[PDB]
């Protein structure tokens, strides 16, 4: 089967690898790099979706929309710092 399933990841290890090669980042790419990088991307994705999931639940909503991603991010010290120079379209601003 795929390397992702092998790494136990949802994210596309193979693609991350193809993307690391074609992106002129280095001449070669260790076998692990793709795996690692994909694990990290999935985790963070999970984190935001987890928080924005709650964002919609606390809003009596079942479908996550931008507003939710924005509320989850700005209301989280760490995510907020990681994305301090990023603006999420149609996300508005924290109330108060």
């Amino acid at each position: 089967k795929t390397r992702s399933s092998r790494a136990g990841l949802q994210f596309p290890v193979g693609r991350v690898h193809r993307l690391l090669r074609k992106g002129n980042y280095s001449e070669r790419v260790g076998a692990g790099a793709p795996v690692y990088l994909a694990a990290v991307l999935e985790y963070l994705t999970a984190e935001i979706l987890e928080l924005a999931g709650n964002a919609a639940r606390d809003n009596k909503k079942t479908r996550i929309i931008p507003r939710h991603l924005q509320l989850a991010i700005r209301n989280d010290e760490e995510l907020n710092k990681l994305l301090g120079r990023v603006t999420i379209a149609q996300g508005g601003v924290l109330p108060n």
Partner: protein, 79 residues
């Protein structure tokens, strides 16, 4: 007089999302000036990407890229 198109009330609203409660009468023109420099800077970079690509249509990506280099990274329009 297009810049005049960005109207007072529209600007009142922005300030309001900004949490501003009282607005001096001179903010309106002052705001258009900042607003104009902002678009001129972003667009100028954007259009430069357009011409590089030899196209005649500014694309949302040409804008996402401009914003990225102005340090105004935007999510939702192609990365």
């Amino acid at each position: 007089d297009n810049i005049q198109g960005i109207t007072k009330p529209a600007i009142r609203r922005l300030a309001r999302r900004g949490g501003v409660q009282r607005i001096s009468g001179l903010i309106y023109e002052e705001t258009r000036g900042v607003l104009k420099v902002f678009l001129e800077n972003v667009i100028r970079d954007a259009v430069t990407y357009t011409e590089h690509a030899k196209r005649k249509t500014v694309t949302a990506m040409d804008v996402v890229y401009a914003l990225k280099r102005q340090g105004r990274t935007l999510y939702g329009f192609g990365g």
